[PDB]
């Protein structure tokens, strides 16, 4: 999974405090070992204006296409790339709905397991 200690600041350079940020996953996503249904979570800015999140990358054919809603009425779309490391919200928002490619590993891995079982059966036959 990936984290995001994105920070939000008041216009006068002071940090927002106890303001609600929202994230929503617009696509039912699923990896080999887990399912991620369309779900939405909310967080509150710390006293210093930071906000943390725990999000998953594109692990299915469809996009792990999140959108974040700011206290200032905005919406912003994006997809968190893969890896295990915290991300800064600035860069991801600068980008958005990066791309998606057919990943059939869940199909491919099962196919490999079944084929290997068949080959072992051939050997034992």
């Amino acid at each position: 999974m990936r984290r995001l200690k994105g920070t939000i600041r008041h216009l006068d350079d002071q940090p927002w405090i106890n303001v609600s940020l929202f994230l929503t996953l617009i696509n039912g996503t699923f990896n080999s070992a887990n399912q991620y249904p369309i779900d939405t979570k909310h967080a509150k800015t710390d006293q210093n204006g930071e906000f943390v999140f725990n999000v998953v990358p594109n692990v299915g054919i469809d996009q792990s296409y999140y959108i974040l809603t700011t206290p200032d009425n905005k919406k912003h779309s994006f997809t968190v790339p893969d890896g295990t490391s915290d991300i800064e919200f600035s860069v991801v928002r600068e980008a958005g709905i990066i791309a998606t490619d057919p990943e059939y590993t869940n199909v491919l891995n099962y196919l490999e397991d079944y084929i290997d079982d068949a080959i072992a059966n051939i050997q034992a036959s």
Partner: protein
């Protein structure tokens, strides 16, 4: 655009039957008039059932729809029977009745009584923690 409105827009096929989103809990407590904690609200949310939650979400969806419809209707009521289309002068009263029925439904499914809230008017089954 209401936040919950978008959140529900995300759900094309019905609405999810999962636990209420803390924002949903906030809104329903607003509708009834609880501070999301009264030692009764949480225990109402302690006892959950699948169809229950779907009913809650559809009812609050209707709450939003009816309130925005009321907001829009006031521009009308200027006239009656333009050519032959009369206007139900009680239409806005009808919308009020529907809204109060919806909040009453929320409370009844949550098994709780209704206190003085933004929508209901003097028709209460509650005061503070108990007033009947």
């Amino acid at each position: 655009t209401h936040p919950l409105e978008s959140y529900y827009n995300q759900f094309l096929d019905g609405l999810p039957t999962s636990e209420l989103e803390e924002l949903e809990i906030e809104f329903v407590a607003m509708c009834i008039g609880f501070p999301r904690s009264q030692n009764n609200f949480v225990n109402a949310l302690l006892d959950l059932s699948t169809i229950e939650v779907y009913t809650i979400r559809t009812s609050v969806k209707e709450i939003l729809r009816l309130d925005k419809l009321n907001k829009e209707s006031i521009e009308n009521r200027q006239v009656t029977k333009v050519e032959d289309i009369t206007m139900n002068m009680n239409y806005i009263g009808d919308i009020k009745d529907e809204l109060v029925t919806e909040v009453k439904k929320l409370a009844r499914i949550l098994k709780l009584p209704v206190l003085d809230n933004l929508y209901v008017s003097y028709d209460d089954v509650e005061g503070r923690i108990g007033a009947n």
